[PDB]
Design a protein around this ligand. Sequence first.
Ligand code: CL
Ligand code: CL
Ligand code: CL
Ligand code: CL
Ligand code: CL
Ligand code: CL
Ligand code: FE
Ligand code: FE
Ligand code: FE
Ligand code: FE
Ligand code: FE
Ligand code: FE
Ligand code: FE
Ligand code: FE
Ligand code: FE
Ligand code: FE
Ligand code: FE
Ligand code: FE
Ligand code: FE
Ligand code: FE
Ligand code: FE
Ligand code: FE
Ligand code: FE
Ligand code: FE
Lengths: 159, 159, 159, 159, 159, 159
Amino acid sequence: SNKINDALNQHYKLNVELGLVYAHYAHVADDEFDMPYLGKFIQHLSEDKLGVHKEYISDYFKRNGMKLKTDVSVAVKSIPSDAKALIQEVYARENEVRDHVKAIAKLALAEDDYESFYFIQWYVRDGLKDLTEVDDVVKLFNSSNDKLIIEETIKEMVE
Amino acid sequence: SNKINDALNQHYKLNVELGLVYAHYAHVADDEFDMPYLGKFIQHLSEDKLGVHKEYISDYFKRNGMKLKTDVSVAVKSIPSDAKALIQEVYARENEVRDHVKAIAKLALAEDDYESFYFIQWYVRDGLKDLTEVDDVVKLFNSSNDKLIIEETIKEMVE
Amino acid sequence: SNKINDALNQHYKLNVELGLVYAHYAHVADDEFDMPYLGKFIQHLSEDKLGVHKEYISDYFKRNGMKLKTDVSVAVKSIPSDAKALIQEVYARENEVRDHVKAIAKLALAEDDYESFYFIQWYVRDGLKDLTEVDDVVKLFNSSNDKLIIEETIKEMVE
Amino acid sequence: SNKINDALNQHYKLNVELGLVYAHYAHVADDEFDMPYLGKFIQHLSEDKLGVHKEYISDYFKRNGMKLKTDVSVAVKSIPSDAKALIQEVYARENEVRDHVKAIAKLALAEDDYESFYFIQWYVRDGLKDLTEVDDVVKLFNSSNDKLIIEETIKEMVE
Amino acid sequence: SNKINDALNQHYKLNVELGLVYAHYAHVADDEFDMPYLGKFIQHLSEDKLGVHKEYISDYFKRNGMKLKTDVSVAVKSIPSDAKALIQEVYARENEVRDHVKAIAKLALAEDDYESFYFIQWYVRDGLKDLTEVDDVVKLFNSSNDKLIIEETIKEMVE
Amino acid sequence: SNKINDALNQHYKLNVELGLVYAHYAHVADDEFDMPYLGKFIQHLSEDKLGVHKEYISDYFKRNGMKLKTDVSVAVKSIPSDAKALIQEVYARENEVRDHVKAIAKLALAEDDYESFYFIQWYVRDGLKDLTEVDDVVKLFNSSNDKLIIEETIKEMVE
Ligand SMILES: [Cl-]
Ligand SMILES: [Cl-]
Ligand SMILES: [Cl-]
Ligand SMILES: [Cl-]
Ligand SMILES: [Cl-]
Ligand SMILES: [Cl-]
Ligand SMILES: [Fe+3]
Ligand SMILES: [Fe+3]
Ligand SMILES: [Fe+3]
Ligand SMILES: [Fe+3]
Ligand SMILES: [Fe+3]
Ligand SMILES: [Fe+3]
Ligand SMILES: [Fe+3]
Ligand SMILES: [Fe+3]
Ligand SMILES: [Fe+3]
Ligand SMILES: [Fe+3]
Ligand SMILES: [Fe+3]
Ligand SMILES: [Fe+3]
Ligand SMILES: [Fe+3]
Ligand SMILES: [Fe+3]
Ligand SMILES: [Fe+3]
Ligand SMILES: [Fe+3]
Ligand SMILES: [Fe+3]
Ligand SMILES: [Fe+3]
């Protein structure tokens, strides 16, 4: 399906662009906000998006004959003002990923593309786990007013 | 130094953009040219550029107080016509990286930035090894007319 | 070079005098400020300066024929008022060390003393790592108002 | 006791200043007198004085409430003329240490400071062992006219 | 750079020619001067110069595109008269190597050849260690009048 | 025997000069002809000639009282045009070595020098094995038109 090919190419672009934004946010968490474990948490998200998250699509295209497109444009022009806002922004972007992944599943059933429906199954499930891990971190900031206490808790999540 | 900060931000951008191009070329080597080990060779170059090659700069900025900029724009709009041309293009881009890395070293001595001169030392040395590994592969294509013989030789270089 | 010999003798004196000051500060961190892990952190800096930091120079002189001078004068006549100020003072002295080490590198190139330029390379690189470790500790004091939380974090840095 | 506090601060100063002198003598033994094992023997004495010898006092002050003073002034302005003279000078300084340590013990009993009397017990005993080890080396120079034979014997004492 | 290519070809020639001279001196140390451990010490220097010392240059040329020249002319037409003189001559030749290596470093910075500057860094550092090891042996001959005592000491340096 | 001494000194010179030529040929095999395993094969021949092949003679002289002469002159002024020609030239030089070694054996029996006859026995036997190993490689070039197939076969001979 051309429409599935386009939607998965769009998802490839999103994984790349968010990975590059997260790499920036991870640097800022450590460098500006004094939170190196928040930085490590966000760096692992960055490495996933620039790693297996994009390679699964590229490899899927190799098997079903679809075409890969590389077209990337992203600039980090402002930064959230503090660390809570930073992880809140990460969360908002991970929810956008959920919406897109669900749209792809719906479209695959529409087009009777059961290979793509089964392929996208991993994203549906795994992305919900990624979103809850991110949500847990956001909340640390409502459970403690102390940045070093929050860091200690995050340390167990990047373990 | 502002000028060193700018040049290292430019080198960060180059590592990112080439990493994304190499990821595309690795896919094409396997998918279109039937050369999965050429694909693996090019994928390892992609993973280096999107990995430690960019993280060393970002981490260096954290120590000396420089500012990181994320501004990325790259589109793969044409593909070399066969596998020799593909690895020849990779080689040409790796030589552009050599030129930039040398310009940074020269500028660091000019500015009496001995921390940056010592930091760039790794790129000078390592990039020469990366360029010779790439040059070895290009040459396989002049040593054999058989794609499966070349693949077998490449297999020992991605080992 | 006489001028390099003088500058490295001055750096030997600085390492000795700061080592003795840091030994005092480490005692005060534990004894007056109730922070024994801050004390241990500062004691390891003291042991480096009175240990390998000075022995590398002395050993370097043995190989290139330079002359060692021992002329030491230091008195600790006032103490910073609290623990944050104490580690802030440590940081200010470590930046003075960076400035001197860079001056030596510049002078070695001027004099075409490539042995000394290569010998000072370790100080340039390593001193930047020491300065960032110290800067991390200073910041704990902006990330937490609780001395026992900061101690727990420092414990992982003296590990 | 103020008088014990002063005498132990004086002993701290002596350990520091002799440690710095011994570090110089160790360098000269190797560099000028061609005796690197004599150098190693004297370096271990230097490391003791700048290490545990001074840290025991500093740590003792932490327990009994005394105050530490850092006030150091030492310059190495002449060097003994040959290696026998060098180790003979070391011996003379180690005897001065014996005299001071004994004065502290006598004063502690006078002041009914039984904690300090018991604390100084280690210095009384250990310093006698250090003085006999040094005396053994001095004598090598009366038992052999050959510097390489003496070095071989010293090698077993720095083992 | 042609001038760097020429200077490194000259350094390749020097390593070869000195290696052949040292091989002769090692034979003479054992055969004529009854000092087989002095012979072994000098043989290891010979094997370094005819081994990695020359192969590093040859391999460096392979990576940066320079041209290797083999043009060798050396004759051992006289021999130092005793063993001290023999190791003194070795020392004089190792100092000539230091001078040439430094000239290459200076020229590389002049030509903005930062690859060659970084490549020559090993020679600058390592050659200073080789020169001090050789200087230690020369001195044995001033520390003992007995050839079998000196041999025993050398035995620990060829270990 | 003076005549045996001269012939073994000539054989020492030949081993040295061929070793230096082979070192050049090994570099060219890899650098110009894209055959790094041919290069490794030729490098091992180079290391033998500059190593044990010459040290056996030098050590033999030490036992029977003969005199060693070092007089070396060799320049590589042209290179065979392709890789087959290169290994063919190596073969021709190894046959010259066979002729000289046989002349020495004949002369030793003439002079009733049974020590030299027995000493040269190793060269007679071993040099025939070296010549057949070289001949096997030459032939690869008649058994395959593909340089990467030949390389793979050579890989098992440098194993
Ligand atoms: Cl389907
Ligand atoms: Cl600097
Ligand atoms: Cl130099
Ligand atoms: Cl008491
Ligand atoms: Cl360069
Ligand atoms: Cl015989
Ligand atoms: Fe920080
Ligand atoms: Fe994951
Ligand atoms: Fe349907
Ligand atoms: Fe395929
Ligand atoms: Fe790498
Ligand atoms: Fe300058
Ligand atoms: Fe306390
Ligand atoms: Fe350190
Ligand atoms: Fe200059
Ligand atoms: Fe010495
Ligand atoms: Fe002791
Ligand atoms: Fe009493
Ligand atoms: Fe002998
Ligand atoms: Fe070496
Ligand atoms: Fe310049
Ligand atoms: Fe090549
Ligand atoms: Fe052999
Ligand atoms: Fe006969």
